[PDB]
Amino acid sequence: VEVLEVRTGPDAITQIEAYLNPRMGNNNPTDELYGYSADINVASSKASDNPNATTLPTYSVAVIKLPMLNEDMTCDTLLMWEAVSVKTEVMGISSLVNLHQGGKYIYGSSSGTIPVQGTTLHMFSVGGEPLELQGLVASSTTTYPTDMVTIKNMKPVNQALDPNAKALLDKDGKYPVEVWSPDPSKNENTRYYGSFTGGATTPPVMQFTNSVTTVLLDENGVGPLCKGDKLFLSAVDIVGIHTNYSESQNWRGLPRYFNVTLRKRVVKNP
Amino acid sequence: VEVLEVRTGPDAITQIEAYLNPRMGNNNPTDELYGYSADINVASSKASDNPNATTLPTYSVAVIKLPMLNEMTCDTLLMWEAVSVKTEVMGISSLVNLHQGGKYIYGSSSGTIPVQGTTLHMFSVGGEPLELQGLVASSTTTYPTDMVTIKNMKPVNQALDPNAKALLDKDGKYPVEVWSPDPSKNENTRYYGSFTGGATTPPVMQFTNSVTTVLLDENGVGPLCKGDKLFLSAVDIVGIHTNYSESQNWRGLPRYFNVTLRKRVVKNP
Amino acid sequence: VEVLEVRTGPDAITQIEAYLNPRMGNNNPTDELYGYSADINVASSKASDNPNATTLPTYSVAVIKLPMLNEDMTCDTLLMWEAVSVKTEVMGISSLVNLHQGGKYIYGSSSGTIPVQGTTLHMFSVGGEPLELQGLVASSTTTYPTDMVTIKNMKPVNQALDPNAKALLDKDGKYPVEVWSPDPSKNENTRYYGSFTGGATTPPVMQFTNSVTTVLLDENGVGPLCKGDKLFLSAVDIVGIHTNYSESQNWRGLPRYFNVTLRKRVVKNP
Amino acid sequence: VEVLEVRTGPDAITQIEAYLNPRMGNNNPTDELYGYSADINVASSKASDNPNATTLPTYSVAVIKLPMLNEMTCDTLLMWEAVSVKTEVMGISSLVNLHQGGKYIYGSSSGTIPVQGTTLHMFSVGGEPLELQGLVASSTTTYPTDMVTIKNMKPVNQALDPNAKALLDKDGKYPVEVWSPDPSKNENTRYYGSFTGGATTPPVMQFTNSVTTVLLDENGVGPLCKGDKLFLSAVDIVGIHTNYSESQNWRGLPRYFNVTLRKRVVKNP
Amino acid sequence: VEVLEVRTGPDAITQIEAYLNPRMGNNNPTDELYGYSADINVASSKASDNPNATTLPTYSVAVIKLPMLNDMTCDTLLMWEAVSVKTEVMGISSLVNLHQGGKYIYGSSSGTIPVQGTTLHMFSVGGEPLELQGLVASSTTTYPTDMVTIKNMKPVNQALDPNAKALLDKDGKYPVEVWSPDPSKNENTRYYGSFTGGATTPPVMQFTNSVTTVLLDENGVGPLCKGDKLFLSAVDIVGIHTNYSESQNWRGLPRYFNVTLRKRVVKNP
Numbered sequence A, C: 001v002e003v004l005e006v007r008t009g010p011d012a013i014t015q016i017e018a019y020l021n022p023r024m025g026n027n028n029p030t031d032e033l034y035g036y037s038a039d040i041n042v043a044s045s046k047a048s049d050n051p052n053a054t055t056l057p058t059y060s061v062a063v064i065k066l067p068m069l070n071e072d073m074t075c076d077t078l079l080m081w082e083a084v085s086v087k088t089e090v091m092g093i094s095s096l097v098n099l100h101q102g103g104k105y106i107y108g109s110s111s112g113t114i115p116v117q118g119t120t121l122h123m124f125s126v127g128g129e130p131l132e133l134q135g136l137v138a139s140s141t142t143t144y145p146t147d148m149v150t151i152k153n154m155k156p157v158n159q160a161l162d163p164n165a166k167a168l169l170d171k172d173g174k175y176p177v178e179v180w181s182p183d184p185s186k187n188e189n190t191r192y193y194g195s196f197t198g199g200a201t202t203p204p205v206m207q208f209t210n211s212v213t214t215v216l217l218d219e220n221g222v223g224p225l226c227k228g229d230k231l232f233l234s235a236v237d238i239v240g241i242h243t244n245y246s247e248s249q250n251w252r253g254l255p256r257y258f259n260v261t262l263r264k265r266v267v268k269n270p
Numbered sequence B, D: 001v002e003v004l005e006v007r008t009g010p011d012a013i014t015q016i017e018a019y020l021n022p023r024m025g026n027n028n029p030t031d032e033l034y035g036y037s038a039d040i041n042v043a044s045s046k047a048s049d050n051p052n053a054t055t056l057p058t059y060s061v062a063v064i065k066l067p068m069l070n071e072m073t074c075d076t077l078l079m080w081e082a083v084s085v086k087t088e089v090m091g092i093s094s095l096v097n098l099h100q101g102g103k104y105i106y107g108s109s110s111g112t113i114p115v116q117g118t119t120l121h122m123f124s125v126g127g128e129p130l131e132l133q134g135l136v137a138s139s140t141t142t143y144p145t146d147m148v149t150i151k152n153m154k155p156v157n158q159a160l161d162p163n164a165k166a167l168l169d170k171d172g173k174y175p176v177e178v179w180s181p182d183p184s185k186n187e188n189t190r191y192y193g194s195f196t197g198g199a200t201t202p203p204v205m206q207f208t209n210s211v212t213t214v215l216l217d218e219n220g221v222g223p224l225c226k227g228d229k230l231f232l233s234a235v236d237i238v239g240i241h242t243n244y245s246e247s248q249n250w251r252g253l254p255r256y257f258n259v260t261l262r263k264r265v266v267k268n269p
Numbered sequence E: 001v002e003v004l005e006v007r008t009g010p011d012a013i014t015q016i017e018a019y020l021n022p023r024m025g026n027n028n029p030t031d032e033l034y035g036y037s038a039d040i041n042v043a044s045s046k047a048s049d050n051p052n053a054t055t056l057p058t059y060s061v062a063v064i065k066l067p068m069l070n071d072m073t074c075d076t077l078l079m080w081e082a083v084s085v086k087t088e089v090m091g092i093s094s095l096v097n098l099h100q101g102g103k104y105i106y107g108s109s110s111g112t113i114p115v116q117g118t119t120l121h122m123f124s125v126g127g128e129p130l131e132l133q134g135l136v137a138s139s140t141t142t143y144p145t146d147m148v149t150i151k152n153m154k155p156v157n158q159a160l161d162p163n164a165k166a167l168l169d170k171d172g173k174y175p176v177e178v179w180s181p182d183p184s185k186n187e188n189t190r191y192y193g194s195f196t197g198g199a200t201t202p203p204v205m206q207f208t209n210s211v212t213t214v215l216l217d218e219n220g221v222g223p224l225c226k227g228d229k230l231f232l233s234a235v236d237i238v239g240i241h242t243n244y245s246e247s248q249n250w251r252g253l254p255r256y257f258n259v260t261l262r263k264r265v266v267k268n269p
């Protein structure tokens, strides 16, 4: 894909918006606990660790279809959509400002309940193809649900970097975050941005505004280029753990809004 | 509406100032605990969660009527454009207090635990009501009917339901735990918010008169005041006060605004 | 006053320095716990809350006499000193690095003692007149010592913004910080800068250098103008709470240094 | 060597990429706890402190062989000059896991405590081995024989002993708790380091492919690759995993490097 | 002294490097606990507080003698002007150690609590001794007489006594809990300091060789070296080590300095 100049003129710009609902484990909108995982089922040992699919947060992904650009496909150059900038926001942050939800008391039974807190993971990506993933787990002896996309035939090497443990973020709510992360050795045509704070009871911290833009251009001034006129939006927004009265625990996720500006870019015809 | 150029000349600029008092639950100035919520009443289960109206912090909103700009058939009209804002949370040092009745830090010889835990700060300046998206921790919660909440909730309301939208058009009626600013709209409002969770988290706040936020968008256009009305919205939950019996009350603080506005030409629609 | 241009030429710049001692409650330098509050006395209830004067930290304020400027008061223009910039420093920070002071053991009786920690409040202001204050309290039912300056005839409204609850910081060690804060609806002729972290055991965080300057000019390039050739310096620097063996507690404060550079500014005669 | 100007023209730039696997103590890819240390064995006293080799995290290092530049007679020669690097800690989200066997957050119905506590991140890019300075918590520790540590330690080694120097010239052999980058040397390497201590501190990390670090010094010169060899070094201890018995293992993560190099003219010495 | 222009020309620039070992109380390189304080001895009362010399961390200071620049009989003279410094706290990774004898994180199967709690970092570069201000937590404390502390203390010394001044003119003698840099003086020194308190706070430090601090003031003048002497001062308390019995030792680390200096013209006094 030899990249040429930006196409100028009227209607060289377009703009899309989308939202991605979280995939915390309860991933059906009819689910009573939609937006949460089911009760974390903990390993009994190193050898015996079979997390339920409903307990494992996965990446969200959506494909946005863009307007057709080329008529004559036999020419020397073609146009592709180039993602230039994005405004993105985690929605419903203030829903966490809630001390009455059933759960564990902060102090005794006269007090409010512990709000969602603990480990957080926030990531968004904008690309002209699927986000390229690298596999790495806390334990290679974990048995993952066969309906999810995880690493095939793990060995202890998979607790670190195994260069064969690669995948594409090409299915919504299927790739667990505890197995997959963005592959920095690839992703030339995607931009991804991530933030992790761990711990079991850590206070979550989030900002929200409509005044902030991220520019997506690389050091050659080129944004993600949308193969087949498709734009890939990916996210995970784990905002912590909700603790229940029995002390069972559910992951809590929040949806993410994207507003992307794209322009026309000239490329050599492959 | 097609936005044209900034109107120059004498008297092109004006300033307004306002303060919004907090709406934590006790929302009447004669309430003993004005500026606080009542004792949080907790759900007994997923199915049974009936929070009292007085326990749910809501958004503050005020509408500022600006000087009338157009007497109406001319081909262009003028609108007030909010260009910048100085905003401040007032009475921060009020929380620097270890004698207020409450729960002892250590044993009964010590000071009491000051306001701490979850904080939520938001301000917005817009030319029309702030646009809101509904999302809740639990769709089986029964909200007081006197408040404005999501009609006919389903589990989808625990995440993004594009049908759950509203306008912040009433002071002290829209619960913060139910509504947040809608990033898919709000072209004519600028909003800024920060959240830090937890049950005992130390609150952190700055105060100064040296800082200004510029409200202009990427085209150099600030919010434009429809019908010459400026909408100022806020919430500043500064934490949780814990009482001796361990009952808890949200504590809020008031917010000052000083907004500078200029005259903007628009094509008459 | 209508402000005009800066006066150029020789002797048009001056510079002052001052320090302000903290007013934590023990405010007499002969007091045994000078620089600390007395043991905090706690409310027994909502209705019954009578904090002792020696337990309530108050703002520091000093007036600095500047060189007299206007020989002829009938002139159509006059000169005022304009505060341009300030270096300011909290002094004796390292005095907190002390684990042997009598107090509460960190662990058992073999360990050091708990250093000063908890709620901190830092504020400095430079103005050409007294800092204007707004009243707001945790509880309107609190009975304050009568020989302090507080809100007269409080009602529950004073737990929020009562527009009638106003004052000037015109007395050193008289205005409790828990009652008064800088009023953002005025203070046109003062710059103030403030920083709060709460909690009961929070670690204090402080910087110290002689390499940092704060410019006092507003958006029109005008600094505080010193009425009657007087410069007002105000401060509070609560660095936390010292816990005693019996678990009684004292607020701890530190003095603040000011170095202000001023220039002559032409104003129209009123 | 006298350093002259940058060589321009076609084919003057090159990129390499590599990843370094962590060396936490279990350092063989077939080890059950590869990517972790073994259970920490604690000293019985000041005098009796014999940490097992598998319990001591060490630095990672890789040598990248670059294209040969010289066909050695001439007055000037060429060297590879490292200009910039993109680096990334991989598999961060693997820590977002509350079901791994371990210690319960609350009682036995809760999730388990994730990796937390002390973290140490370092990467370096240089034209030769990273130069190290020795300093320990205790000179009466007896280190495993098969590791490289300070010979004939004395109490002076609990602070700066100018004789205690080394080169990071072996992967998984130099303990982090013994060696750190020597700021009095390393003129031909750039290193960047971050430490947060504590027993149970929440780990914090970001990840992106939008960030580049420029390696040029104040004279605009990057590390120069002696013998066409580029040295990449790292450690990324991300915290401690606590087991059900309360035994503890260090946990590390691998680091990706992408380095851009150019040709630099130097005088033939 | 009237300061004139910078001397341009060849050989106008010089560089020095140095390191300062910490003085935490065990200040002798043969001390078993070199680089730490002795076990903190606590006051039994307000009235009775006698910290041992070995439990009180003190400032480090070195004097670097620079090349002689001047004949003293000419209209103008030259002084060395400190222009910039690279500085580094060394052996940071030595804290990354969970096996050192101490207090268990959990029960006796776990690692031990690492150095944590109060930290104090300061460095200064000056052309004469750092000027100090005295201020103490308690005026009734009896300091060791062979240390340099405030003479005849009164309760005024718990705040600002303008008479309580000193010079940092001796290594390992001036306690940090008594003296701090005096902002009312030090026109010929640049000092930079950071404090975080608390008893168990995680320590946080960076290390790199890519960062320089410029020492020029607002007039573009760096510290001027009187009698061709450069003063380097430091303290780097990195936390508290807790022992098995719960006794506690301050822990310090050494600091490296690399200072660049230039020739400055001054009028002969």
Ligand SMILES: CC(=O)N[C@@H]1[C@@H](O)[C@H](O[C@@H]2O[C@H](CO)[C@H](O)[C@H](O[C@]3(C(=O)O)C[C@H](O)[C@@H](NC(=O)CO)[C@H]([C@H](O)[C@H](O)CO)O3)[C@H]2O)[C@@H](CO)O[C@H]1O
Pocket: A033, A036, A038, A039, A101, A102, A103, A104, A242, A243, A244, A245, A246, A248, A249, A250, B044, B045, B046, B047, B137, B138
């Ligand atoms: C008489 C009788 O047996 N009635 C039972 C009810 O007791 C039961 O209600 C559930 O009972 C739990 C008792 O430990 C608990 O009160 C449930 O409420 C919560 C919880 O605390 O666990 C409230 C939480 O807010 C909720 N979690 C979330 O919404 C997100 O984290 C959890 C959650 O729904 C469950 O834990 C599932 O993971 O429930 C309370 O609902 C009822 C249902 O089991 O059955 C009756 O017959």
Ligand SMILES: CC(=O)N[C@@H]1[C@@H](O)[C@H](O[C@@H]2O[C@H](CO)[C@H](O)[C@H](O[C@]3(C(=O)O)C[C@H](O)[C@@H](NC(=O)CO)[C@H]([C@H](O)[C@H](O)CO)O3)[C@H]2O)[C@@H](CO)O[C@H]1O
Pocket: B033, B036, B038, B039, B100, B101, B102, B103, B241, B242, B243, B244, B245, B247, B248, B249, C044, C045, C046, C047, C139
């Ligand atoms: C024998 C008897 O019943 N006597 C009652 C008093 O008990 C009662 O006074 C109230 O008593 C409480 C005992 O736990 C408590 O001491 C009340 O003080 C506080 C509190 O700690 O709860 C002080 C708090 O500062 C205050 N909270 C706030 O202002 C904001 O968070 C609370 C608050 O007013 C209440 O918790 C209600 O939400 O009160 C003390 O007032 C008295 C009044 O009912 O009646 C006596 O006869």
Ligand SMILES: CC(=O)N[C@@H]1[C@@H](O)[C@H](O[C@@H]2O[C@H](CO)[C@H](O)[C@H](O[C@]3(C(=O)O)C[C@H](O)[C@@H](NC(=O)CO)[C@H]([C@H](O)[C@H](O)CO)O3)[C@H]2O)[C@@H](CO)O[C@H]1O
Pocket: C033, C036, C038, C039, C101, C102, C103, C104, C242, C243, C244, C245, C246, C248, C249, C250, E044, E045, E046, E047, E137, E138
């Ligand atoms: C032989 C005998 O019994 N003598 C007694 C003394 O015991 C007594 O001295 C005081 O004893 C207290 C025991 O509860 C305590 O140790 C006092 O020391 C401290 C304190 O911990 O309370 C030390 C603190 O550093 C100090 N606080 C500050 O300086 C700033 O926070 C406090 C403070 O002075 C008091 O708490 C008052 O606020 O004191 C110790 O002085 C002696 C005096 O009561 O009486 C003898 O009979």
Ligand SMILES: CC(=O)N[C@@H]1[C@@H](O)[C@H](O[C@@H]2O[C@H](CO)[C@H](O)[C@H](O[C@]3(C(=O)O)C[C@H](O)[C@@H](NC(=O)CO)[C@H]([C@H](O)[C@H](O)CO)O3)[C@H]2O)[C@@H](CO)O[C@H]1O
Pocket: A044, A045, A046, A047, A138, A139, D033, D036, D038, D039, D100, D101, D102, D103, D241, D242, D243, D244, D245, D247, D248, D249
């Ligand atoms: C019936 C019977 O006795 N079976 C035994 C098993 O008990 C034993 O399995 C091990 O049992 C341990 C009992 O405390 C423990 O539960 C082991 O699980 C963990 C652990 O918590 O220690 C799970 C951890 O996630 C894992 N740690 C890591 O992977 C990284 O920190 C550790 C780790 O594998 C070991 O502790 C090594 O330090 O194990 C559980 O595996 C079994 C094997 O010993 O032997 C059976 O006969």
Ligand SMILES: CC(=O)N[C@@H]1[C@@H](O)[C@H](O[C@@H]2O[C@H](CO)[C@H](O)[C@H](O[C@]3(C(=O)O)C[C@H](O)[C@@H](NC(=O)CO)[C@H]([C@H](O)[C@H](O)CO)O3)[C@H]2O)[C@@H](CO)O[C@H]1O
Pocket: D044, D045, D046, D047, D137, D138, E033, E036, E038, E039, E100, E101, E102, E103, E241, E242, E243, E244, E245, E247, E248, E249
């Ligand atoms: C079998 C028997 O009786 N053995 C004893 C030894 O136990 C004893 O050694 C000392 O024993 C102490 C018991 O509390 C303690 O374990 C000493 O180790 C430590 C400590 O935890 O106190 C280890 C610390 O790392 C070290 N601190 C530092 O290095 C820096 O902070 C401290 C420190 O050296 C002392 O606390 C002095 O302040 O020591 C352990 O050495 C032995 C000699 O005492 O005598 C045998 O008979």
Ligand SMILES: [Ca+2]
Pocket: A185, A186, D017
């Ligand atoms: Ca690649």
Ligand SMILES: [Ca+2]
Pocket: A017, B184, B185
């Ligand atoms: Ca829209």
Ligand SMILES: [Ca+2]
Pocket: B017, C185, C186
């Ligand atoms: Ca006003």
Ligand SMILES: [Ca+2]
Pocket: D184, D185, E017
């Ligand atoms: Ca050197």
Ligand SMILES: [Ca+2]
Pocket: C017, E184, E185
């Ligand atoms: Ca002076």
